[PDB]
Design a protein around this ligand. Structure first.
Ligand code: 4QM
Ligand code: MG
Ligand code: ZN
Ligand code: ZN
Ligand code: ZN
Lengths: 146, 390, 49, 50, 335, 50, 50, 48, 67, 101, 243
RNA sequence: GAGAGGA
């Protein structure tokens, strides 16, 4: 009694969303070139290749993999400040690449960056970079507290 | 599920099953009375015309070819005759008398050089009706029927009946008679002896339907202290999620009854108690739970777990792979839309419908979609006017 | 490096038939949604669908 | 009324016996109505409950 | 544990070989003859015309299982392969009757024939030294006596049953001399081949050839060739008293006994015991009994279908394994 | 070497052999039975005992 | 001519015991209750109604 | 991978075009014919 | 139809014993178990080959078309 | 001479032997298990194992990995010779036992 | 799929890939199409390929993985009671492969009484059978039946049962194989990690090795369900009746 | 055309 109803529902659901494509400007669009979404899901991340709960990196397992792949017995463990400096010199050159232009095309004056009225694309990337920095800061803080 | 699939279990049909010309009969060569009977089956005479055989089942994960409901049939038991079946199919022919006082002549049996019949008539006989006991193949006319071209007598268009089958079958009955209106009627029965090939469906009288996953030799099979090898090795994973404890009790009751030389009763709300069967099983020197300790047939050492071992009444179902294999490259196409036909009696393709094309769309495969739904299905070179698009 | 690689890899590649993927992802689980009787978080009287 | 008579099934003996003593519901399809397709306790001993 | 495999109530432990170097720091048990020559032993128990029960001692499971497998489906035998029907009016379909005839064992000793070459046409594929021709010709007619009606169809119909002994044997050429002393006959002449009522005839001719067991079950020489590890029972913490009788009710009768006067349970003979681990169910014999099997002490029970003596079959199995190893050794190691 | 290897109808009721000439009848002769079965071929038929 | 249900008060198989049935090529264990129309075994299924 | 019967792998033909890399293989398949499995069913000439 | 010549699981030739088995049930009426054991059928595969067998050919032969 | 029964798979085989895989046609566990038992008894054999890749094919891939002393081919040859010796010992013992009876 | 030719009449496919199709082997049937152009064939094998579709698109969780009896074989191998000598270990390693992969035998877990390996060691060899295979997996997972350790302060490795699975450097340091480790539906599986870190080919190779291993280990080991596996204990009857 | 398996 449920098979037929589920089949009909799937058929019509597919008939609705039949022609939606992620265009090369990173906008989901329909056949008539009417933009339905400006970025898929707000982040442009395909769920097929996400490795965590609503995050794409699974920080703990990736950190363990990096630890094990590059573990030599005679290596000088850096101080936590050195770890943070490495994180900020690898992450932050990428953060500079995103500038958060205003809706009028001008640049935000560094005092109203988080004014909640100037958010746009590349916000997900900034949040991801901040999460990476926070995770590395947590590891360094654990080392310092030890 | 057992009530559903017990109707489609091949076996004895009637005492006159050999004097009968039906459209499609499935018969069992060596049907066997069930070990664990029921008070109902004595009343409906199911122990006199059974459909199944008592297979020595060993419930054990073996060979890997029995993962999901798949079975492991035992070669050297199929050879001795186990699941051997027969398919009888009738072909009728009416020699109608047309209103123009013209009949249909079954004259045939052409001869090539140096006498002898031609290959297509090699199994036809002098009278145009296939010789009883011969073998026919693709081609091999066995009813050489001719029909007048002036039905609306010399001009006889030949319209023979051709055996169009994938495997040879034998002619075992040819009946010629007339109906009330005095018109000739010929019924030819073709028998085909079938072997339990890989891919045939076997049921277990408990809803444990399965396919013959693999056929392995006798020596590559577990054996007990007495050298018994199982005929069927059913996977143990069919039980824990379907809760067919009745099947385990059937195995124990059957083993105990056959060791005691009697037929045990499995009937609803009663039947042979498990305690008596276990007492009989331990009296003969077997384990109280029916779990013997086997030797691996390929390494020759003990199996580190005792194996549920005993006779289970397994019935072979009619859904055989020989009748279901079907492939097409090119052939008949529909007259209207010029697309391949649908059935199997007509060599036709497999329909790739809306769900399948949506699945292809999901992958984002455009050239494959174009090839499947246009190039390999129906392509037409049309001439469209560039001014008025007609 | 691993985090950045797995992030730049985990972007919806252009040309993806995301509409069909979404429609199937929302319809196929419906084919397995056997009717289970539920209530509104501990309120037996308040029946829900 | 259509489909009153059925060709007797000849696969096993139990198939031909079970085609006899068979009952057909008057409902055509009963698409979503889970009433006539349920196992009413009132049929205990009257109809095969399996 | 040390050439013993324990039988527990829920499992079987220590079923592996562990008789090779590298199993321990002291790399002992390295292969060498003149040490296996003396340890190995054969104790031939009751040997009959169609059965042999010989115990093999101090061989690992691999070799014994290889012998068993070769015995079942490597030792050649002679059975009907092609059946030609001249007339079959019996109710049995022709293919079924041909299968029944093919399954019938033949008391023709192999090595008196040669392998048939499949690469030849049927007109000259079968020779006199290659195949054996068996004829059957049975015609059923009524019995013009005056017995009671509706009685058994043996004194009412003449030749109403067709047995396997109805298979005749006509030699061709040299077969008139080689098979003069021992004409080929069904090893079991009472096999009910077919049944038939008056007016029915079965007339056929079968070209029985030489085949291998792995090809078809009709070519297997033995009914079943098996073995089993010798059972072993350790009665520790003696169980003397009335409880001993209970301890006796588990094992088969001729397995353990109660010592006269001492009224103490003792092992009589473990060879008669089938390991049903019954004592492992009562939990009052948790430490009073320890079951097991001797991992390298098999007791083969070979029984033939009638073609040849079982000891000849086992000898052929050993020779076939040796021939296989030798031929593999002679075969060049190509890349 | 070598090893050689190498129109009648029956009434369904009277079980008697018949020979029907062209355009005479289709019934039996001993009785009036109208059903005839073709006799088995006299030609050799080969079956593998496999 | 009214078709006769198998093993009814009008059928010849009514009260036939293992010899009449054998002479008529009829299986003793056959259920009956079905008609033979155009040489086909057609059974009128029991119809349930309100 | 999926296993296919040779009874249907001999009707499910694939049209391979001669390309001077598989000319020998394709002509060997033609020599084999439509009965032995590693063979061929139909040949379509360039102009015909 | 008739008794299988060979017992599928083991291979024993059980075709010849059938008639003998019937006698052990008709004259000197034993039980089925004792009659089966007296014929040498020790393994239960050969036992179920004979015990659970229907002699259908007896019923089939009542309809011979050459009486 | 029959250069089909035994083949040495080159892809699996390492340089200068000491680890080699062999493909044997028309064989099954019957000889594979006995050969594995005999080879594993050699003091210089580190790895020895057979496997039938697919029951539809008569094949037997047997791999022997020895140490830097005896090549795998010589290990297989000695295993075959020792299997012949074992069969001869069993045959002789059985013959003398049956003759004595 | 890539076609292979076999004598029988049935479309035979590895059971691991039967979770997408929802195949049953109870008598199910399937359709097989053959693309007739190079473009269609290439698009099929590169976009619709099995190796490239190990994850379902609705959630990204793996869906092609160990089915029934493969999880059972893995659990029986990796159960802590398992201890294999050298001959048995080499036979297992030739069973998982086809006598073609060169195996670097690690030092045994137990050395002094005898030389005994462990099922976790043999599965770690299955993951990385050489020093050339690049599959080094670092993973921490938790099975479906995880019993926490006695002390709250203790890590999950010290579980009462095997429980938490710790794999470091492709060595299964602790834990047993399970549906949450080899099966489907979890993003912390061994196959999922192998795929996500080294492409679909290595995951396919590992799954093939596991399937070939478990196709023969259950046959040569024995695993059965009987009436004593479902019968209730003597005191269980009285306790149930009282309750 | 319409009766019924089937997955
Ligand atoms: C290649 C097969 C040849 C076969 C016909 C010959 C060759 C060697 C013969 C055996 C040996 O003599 C040893 C035993 C001697 C006893 O006295 C009788 C039994 C015994 C097993 C013999 C049987 C038979 O006679 C054999 C197998
Ligand atoms: Mg299914
Ligand atoms: Zn125009
Ligand atoms: Zn007549
Ligand atoms: Zn038997």
């Amino acid at each position: 009694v449920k098979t037929a109803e589920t089949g009909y529902m799937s058929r019509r659901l597919m008939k609705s969303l039949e022609d939606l494509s992620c265009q090369y400007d990173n906008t989901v669009r329909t056949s008539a070139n009417g933009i339905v979404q400006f970025t898929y899901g707000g982040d442009g991340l395909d769920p097929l290749e996400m490795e965590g709960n609503a995050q794409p990196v699974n920080f703990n397992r990736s950190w363990d993999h990096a630890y094990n792949i590059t573990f030599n017995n005679q290596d000088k463990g850096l101080l936590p400040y050195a770890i943070m400096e490495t994180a900020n010199e690898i992450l932050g050159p990428l953060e500079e690449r995103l500038v958060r232009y205003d809706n009028s095309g001008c640049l935000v004056k560094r005092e109203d960056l988080n004014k909640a009225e100037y958010v746009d694309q590349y916000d997900a990337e900034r949040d991801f970079y901040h999460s990476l920095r926070e995770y590395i800061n947590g590891k360094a803080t654990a080392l310092a507290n030890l | 599920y057992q009530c559903a699939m017990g109707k489609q279990a091949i076996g004895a049909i009637a005492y006159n099953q050999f004097k009968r010309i039906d459209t499609l009969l499935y018969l069992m060569t060596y049907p066997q009375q069930p070990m664990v009977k029921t008070k109902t089956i004595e009343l409906i005479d199911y122990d006199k015309l059974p459909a199944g055989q008592n297979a020595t089942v060993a419930v054990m994960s073996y060979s890997g070819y029995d993962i999901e409901d798949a079975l492991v049939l035992n070669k050297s038991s199929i050879d001795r005759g186990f699941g051997r079946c027969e398919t009888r199919r009738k072909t009728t022919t009416v020699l109608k008398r047309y209103a123009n006082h013209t009949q249909d002549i079954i004259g045939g049996m052409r001869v090539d050089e140096n006498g002898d019949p031609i290959w297509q008539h090699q199994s036809l006989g002098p009278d145009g009706l296939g010789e009883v006991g011969m073998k026919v193949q693709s081609g091999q006319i066995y009813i050489n029927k001719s029909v007048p071209t002036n039905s609306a007598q010399t001009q006889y268009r030949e319209a023979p009946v051709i055996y169009r089958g994938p495997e040879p079958s034998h002619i075992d009955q040819v009946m010629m008679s007339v109906s009330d209106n005095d018109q000739a009627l010929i019924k030819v029965l073709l028998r085909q002896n079938r072997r339990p090939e890989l891919g045939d469906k076997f049921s277990s009288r408990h809803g444990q339907k399965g396919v013959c996953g693999i056929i392995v030799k006798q020596e590559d099979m577990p054996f007990n202290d007495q050298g018994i090898v199982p005929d069927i090795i059913m996977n143990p994973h069919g039980f824990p999620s379907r809760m067919t404890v009745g099947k385990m009790i059937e195995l124990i009751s059957g083993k105990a009854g056959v060791l005691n030389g009697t037929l045990e009763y499995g009937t609803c709300f009663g039947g042979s108690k498990l305690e008596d069967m276990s007492k009989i099983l331990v009296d003969q020197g077997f384990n109280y739970s029916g779990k013997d300790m086997l030797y691996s047939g390929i390494t020759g050492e003990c199996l580190q777990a005792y194996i549920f071992f005993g006779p289970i009444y397994y019935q072979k179902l009619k859904h055989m792979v020989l009748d279901k294999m079907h492939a097409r490259a090119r052939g008949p196409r529909a007259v209207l839309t010029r697309q391949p036909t649908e059935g199997r009696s007509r060599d036709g393709g497999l329909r790739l419908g809306e769900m399948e094309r949506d699945c292809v769309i999901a992958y984002g495969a455009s050239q494959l979609l174009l090839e499947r739904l246009m190039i390999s299905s129906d392509a037409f070179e049309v001439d469209v006017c560039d001014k008025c698009g007609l | 490096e691993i985090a950045l690689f797995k992030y730049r890899k985990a972007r919806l590649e252009p040309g993806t038939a995301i509409g069909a993927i979404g429609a199937q992802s929302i319809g196929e689980p419906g084919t397995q949604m056997t009717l289970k009787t539920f209530h509104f978080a501990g309120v037996a009287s308040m029946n829900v669908t | 009324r259509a489909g009153v008579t059925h060709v007797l099934s000849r696969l096993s003996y139990i198939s031909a016996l079970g085609m006899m003593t068979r009952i057909s519901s008057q409902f055509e399809k009963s698409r979503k109505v889970s009433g006539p397709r349920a196992l009413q306790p009132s049929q205990f001993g009257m109809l095969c409950t399996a | 544990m040390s050439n013993i495999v324990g039988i527990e109530y829920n499992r079987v432990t220590n079923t592996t070989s562990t008789d090779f170097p590298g199993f321990s720091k002291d790399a002992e048990n390295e292969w060498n003859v003149e040490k296996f020559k003396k340890d190995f032993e054969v104790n031939i128990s009751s040997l009959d015309a169609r059965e042999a029960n010989f115990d093999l001692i101090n061989i690992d499971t691999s070799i014994a299982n290889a012998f068993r497998r070769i015995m079942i489906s490597e030792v050649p035998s002679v059975a009907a392969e092609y059946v030609y029907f001249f007339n079959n009016t019996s109710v049995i379909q022709d293919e079924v009757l041909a299968h029944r005839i093919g399954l019938v064992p033949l008391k023709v000793d192999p090595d008196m024939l040669t392998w048939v070459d499949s690469n030849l046409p049927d007109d000259e594929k079968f020779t006199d030294e290659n195949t054996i021709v068996l004829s059957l010709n049975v015609k059923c007619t009524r019995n013009p006596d005056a017995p009671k009606g509706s009685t058994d169809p043996k004194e009412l119909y003449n030749n109403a049953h067709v047995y396997a002994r109805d298979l005749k044997f006509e030699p061709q050429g040299r077969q008139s001399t080689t098979f003069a002393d021992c004409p080929v006959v069904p090893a079991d002449p009472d096999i009910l081949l077919a049944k038939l009522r008056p007016g029915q005839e079965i007339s056929l001719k079968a070209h029985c050839i030489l085949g291998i067991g792995g090809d078809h079950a009709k070519f297997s020489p033995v009914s079943t060739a098996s073995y089993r590890l010798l059972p072993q029972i350790n009665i520790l913490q003696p169980i003397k008293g009335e409880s001993a009788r209970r301890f006796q009710k588990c094992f088969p009768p001729g397995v353990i006994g109660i010592d006269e006067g001492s009224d103490e349970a003792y092992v009589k003979d473990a060879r008669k015991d089938t390991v049903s681990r019954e004592v492992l169910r009562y939990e009052e014999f948790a430490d009073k009994v320890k079951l097991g099997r001797v991992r390298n002490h098999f007791i083969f029970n070979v029984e033939s279908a009638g073609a040849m003596t079982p000891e000849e079959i086992f000898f052929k199995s050993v020779r076939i394994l040796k021939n296989k190893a030798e031929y593999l050794k002679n075969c060049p190691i190509t890349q | 070497x070598x090893x050689x290897x190498x129109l009648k109808y029956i009434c369904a009721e009277c079980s008697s052999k018949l020979s029907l000439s062209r355009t005479d009848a289709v019934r039996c002769k001993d009785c009036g039975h109208r059903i005839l079965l073709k006799a088995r071929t006299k030609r050799l038929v080969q079956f593998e005992a496999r | 001519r009214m078709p006769i249900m198998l093993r009814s008060n009008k059928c010849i198989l009514y009260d036939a015991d293992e010899s009449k049935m054998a002479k008529l090529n009829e299986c003793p264990l056959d259920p009956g209750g079905y008609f033979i129309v155009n040489g086909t075994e057609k059974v009128i299924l029991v119809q349930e109604q309100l | 991978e999926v296993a296919v019967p040779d009874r249907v792998a001999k009707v499910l033909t694939y049209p391979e075009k001669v390309t001077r890399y598989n000319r020998h293989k394709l002509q060997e398949l033609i020599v084999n014919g439509p009965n032995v499995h590693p063979g061929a069913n139909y040949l379509l000439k360039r102009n015909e | 139809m008739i008794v299988p010549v060979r017992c599928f699981s083991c291979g024993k030739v059980v075709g010849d014993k059938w008639e003998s088995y019937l006698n052990l049930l008709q004259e000197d009426e034993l039980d089925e178990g004792t009659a089966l054991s007296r014929l040498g059928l020790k393994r239960y595969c050969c036992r179920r080959m004979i015990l659970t067998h229907v002699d259908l050919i007896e019923k089939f032969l009542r309809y011979n078309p050459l009486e | 001479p029959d250069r089909e029964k035994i083949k040495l798979l080159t892809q699996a085989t390492s340089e200068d032997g000491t680890s080699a895989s062999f493909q044997i046609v028309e064989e099954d566990h019957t000889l594979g298990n006995a050969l594995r038992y005999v080879i594993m008894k050699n003091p210089d054999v580190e790895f020895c194992g057979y496997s039938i890749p697919h029951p539809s094919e008569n094949l037997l891939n047997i791999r022997i990995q020895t140490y830097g002393e005896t090549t795998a081919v010589d290990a297989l040859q000695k295993g075959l010779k020792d299997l012949m010796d074992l069969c001869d010992v069993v045959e002789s013992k059985f013959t003398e036992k049956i003759k004595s009876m | 799929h890539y076609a292979k030719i076999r004598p029988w009449r049935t479309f035979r496919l590895n059971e691991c890939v039967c979770t997408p199709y929802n195949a049953d082997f109870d008598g199910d049937e399937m359709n097989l199409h053959v693309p007739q152009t190079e473009e269609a064939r290439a698009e099929a094998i590169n976009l619709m390929g099995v190796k490239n579709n190990l994850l379902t698109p609705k959630s990204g969780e793996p869906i092609i993985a160990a089915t029934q009896d493969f999880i059972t074989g893995s659990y029986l191998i990796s159960h802590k009671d398992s201890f294999y000598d050298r001959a048995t270990l080499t036979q297992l390693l030739s069973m998982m492969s086809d006598g073609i992969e060169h195996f670097d035998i690690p030092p045994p877990a137990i050395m002094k009484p005898y030389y005994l390996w462990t099922g976790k060691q043999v599965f770690s060899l299955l993951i990385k059978p050489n020093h050339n295979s690049p599959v080094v997996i670092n993973l921490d997972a938790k099975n479906k039946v995880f019993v926490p350790p006695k002390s709250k302060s203790l890590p999950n490795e010290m579980s009462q049962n095997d429980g938490f699975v710790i794999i470091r450097g492709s060595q299964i340091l602790s834990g047993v194989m399970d549906k949450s480790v080899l099966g489907d539906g979890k993003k912390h599986s061994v196959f999922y990690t192998i795929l996500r870190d080294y492409g679909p080919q290595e995951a396919a190779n590992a799954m093939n090795r596991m399937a070939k291993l478990c196709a023969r280990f259950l046959g040569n080991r024995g695993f059965s369900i009987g009436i004593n596996d479902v019968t209730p204990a003597d005191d269980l009857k009285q306790k149930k009746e009282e309750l």
